[PDB]
Amino acid sequence: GFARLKRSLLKTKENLGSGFISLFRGKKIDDDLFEELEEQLLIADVGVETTRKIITNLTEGASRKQLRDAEALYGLLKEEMGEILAKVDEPLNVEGKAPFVILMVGVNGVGKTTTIGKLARQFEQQGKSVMLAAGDTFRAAAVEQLQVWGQRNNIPVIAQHTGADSASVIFDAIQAAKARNIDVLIADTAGRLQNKSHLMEELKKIVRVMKKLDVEAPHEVMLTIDASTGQNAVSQAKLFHEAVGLTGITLTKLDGTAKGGVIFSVADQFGIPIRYIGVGERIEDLRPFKADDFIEALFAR
Numbered sequence: 688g689f690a691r692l693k694r695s696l697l698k699t700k701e702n703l704g705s706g707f708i709s710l711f712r713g714k715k716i717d718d719d720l721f722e723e724l725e726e727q728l729l730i731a732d733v734g735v736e737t738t739r740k741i742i743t744n745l746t747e748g749a750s751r752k753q754l755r756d757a758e759a760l761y762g763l764l765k766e767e768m769g770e771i772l773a774k775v776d777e778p779l780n781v782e783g784k785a786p787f788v789i790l791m792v793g794v795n796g797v798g799k800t801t802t803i804g805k806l807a808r809q810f811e812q813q814g815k816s817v818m819l820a821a822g823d824t825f826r827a828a829a830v831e832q833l834q835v836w837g838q839r840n841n842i843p844v845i846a847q848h849t850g851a852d853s854a855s856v857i858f859d860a861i862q863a864a865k866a867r868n869i870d871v872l873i874a875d876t877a878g879r880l881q882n883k884s885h886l887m888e889e890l891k892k893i894v895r896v897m898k899k900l901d902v903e904a905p906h907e908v909m910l911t912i913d914a915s916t917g918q919n920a921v922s923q924a925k926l927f928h929e930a931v932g933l934t935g936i937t938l939t940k941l942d943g944t945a946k947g948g949v950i951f952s953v954a955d956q957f958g959i960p961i962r963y964i965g966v967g968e969r970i971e972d973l974r975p976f977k978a979d980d981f982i983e984a985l986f987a988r
């Protein structure tokens with residue numbers, strides 16, 4: 688089962704899930720073993736606090752049941768790590784708004800624009816009318832690429848001149864979306880690295896200006912982070928969550944990275960739903976996040 692997800696997670700399975708089988712083989716449950724497991728969880732980018740939680744619960748479960756052979760930890764670890772991901776299993780529901788506004792936040796390079804395009808295509812396949820807002824206003828090649836993309840896919844793209852105020856572009860886009868009976872409006876934003884404080888102030892301005900037209904907008908504040916950046920994904924999530932207030936996360940580029948275990952750190956540290964995971968190049972490879980599928984693929988033996 689889950690052949691495609693298992694292949695996308697092949698390098699992560701070296702360190703987690705089925706990867707624990709070799710660590711436990713023929714070993715006894717003692718402090719040495721838990722020290723080896725802690726190290727391996729840390730190597731897998733599970734994170735300091737999340738690893739401590741797992742080890743604590745696992746040790747108590749092992750002692751209370753008086754488990755002796757390390758192989759018996761496998762099922763317990765599967766349960767512990769599965770409960771971490773279950774807490775952020777909640778698919779995005781865009782139904783019933785006019786438009787449903789998604790504010791896409793994140794740094795450049797992580798897959799933010801790619802994810803916008805895949806989401807837009809998926810929503811249109813579901814029968815929705817989609818509009819995009821080109822809010823990354825100082826990156827002229829990026830804006831024109833999004834426009835060319837919209838023209839190729841017959842999806843309207845709201846944009847202004849290079850250097851325009853992002854909040855003004857997004858205001859015009861919400862106005863146009865309402866006038867055109869748009870179901871989903873997806874707003875891109877800047878993701879530049881220099882002067883982080885300026886970017887965060889820009890996002891708060893965008894939200895305030897949105898609410899001049901619809902006090903419920905943005906209905907979703909979605910962060911995109913890149914699993915191949917390891918703990919940088921965690922630091923980015925903390926930055927954007929404290930700055931604007933996230934309501935969903937997309938985790939991209941799980942395929943071909945050994946750092947996929949960072950998903951447990953993101954889930955445990957923030958408790959924000961993971962709406963989608965990117966596990967390949969297809970439109971359909973931006974898949975809704977399902978915790979039990981992910982755990983089954985990871986721990987399959």
Ligand SMILES: Nc1nc2c(ncn2[C@@H]2O[C@H](COP(=O)(O)OP(=O)(O)O)[C@@H](O)[C@H]2O)c(=O)[nH]1
Pocket residue numbers: 793794795796797798799800801802878939940941942964965966967968
């Ligand atoms: N392997 C892989 N590459 C991805 C995925 N999602 C996005 N990318 C690539 O990440 C790169 C950066 O994407 P972009 O959307 O341009 O990044 P932004 O700066 O955050 O907008 C592009 O080459 C995308 O194709 C994914 O799930 N898997």
Ligand SMILES: [K+]
Pocket residue numbers: 854855858896
């Ligand atoms: K305005």
Ligand SMILES: [Mg+2]
Pocket residue numbers: 795799800823829
């Ligand atoms: Mg972009």
